[PDB]
Amino acid sequence: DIFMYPMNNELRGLWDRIENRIYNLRHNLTLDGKEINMDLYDS
Amino acid sequence: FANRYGYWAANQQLRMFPEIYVDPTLRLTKTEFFFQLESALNQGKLTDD
């Protein structure tokens, strides 16, 4: 009736991003950062 | 302050300090007295009057 090839996709990007986010909960979306420090009286 | 060690630490330090450098060139205390005073300071050149 109809005449496919496996390519009619791309819709899943929502899921894909989600999955990635979760993996970047297991860690961090590119690397893990580093903190900041402070000073006295000038404070 | 408690957000961070050094932040908190500095807070502690100040709250320890009886005084070393609190040097109230400015201060929490205020009244328009303070701006009036400043106006006195900043007008012209300083004088006893």
**Smallest Cα distance from B6 to chain A, Å:** 5
Radius of gyration of chain A (CA): 22
Q: Which of B4, B7, B21 sits opposite A41 (nearest CB)?
A: B21
Q: How far apart are the first and last CA of chain A?
A: 75
| CB contact at 8 A, B7 and A37 | no
State how far the Cα of B8 lies from the Cα of B1, in Å rounded to an integer: 4
Q: Which residues of B touch A35 (CB under 8 A)?
A: 4
Q: Which residues of B touch A36 (CB under 8 A)?
A: 4
Structure solved via: cryo-EM
Q: What is the DSSP secondary structure assignment for residue B21, as one 8-state letter?
A: S
Tokens found for residue B14: 């100040």
Portion 9-38 of B in contact with A at CB < 8 A: 9-11, 13-14, 20-21
State how far the Cα of A39 lies from the Cα of A14, in Å rounded to an integer: 44
| CB contact at 8 A, B10 and A40 | yes
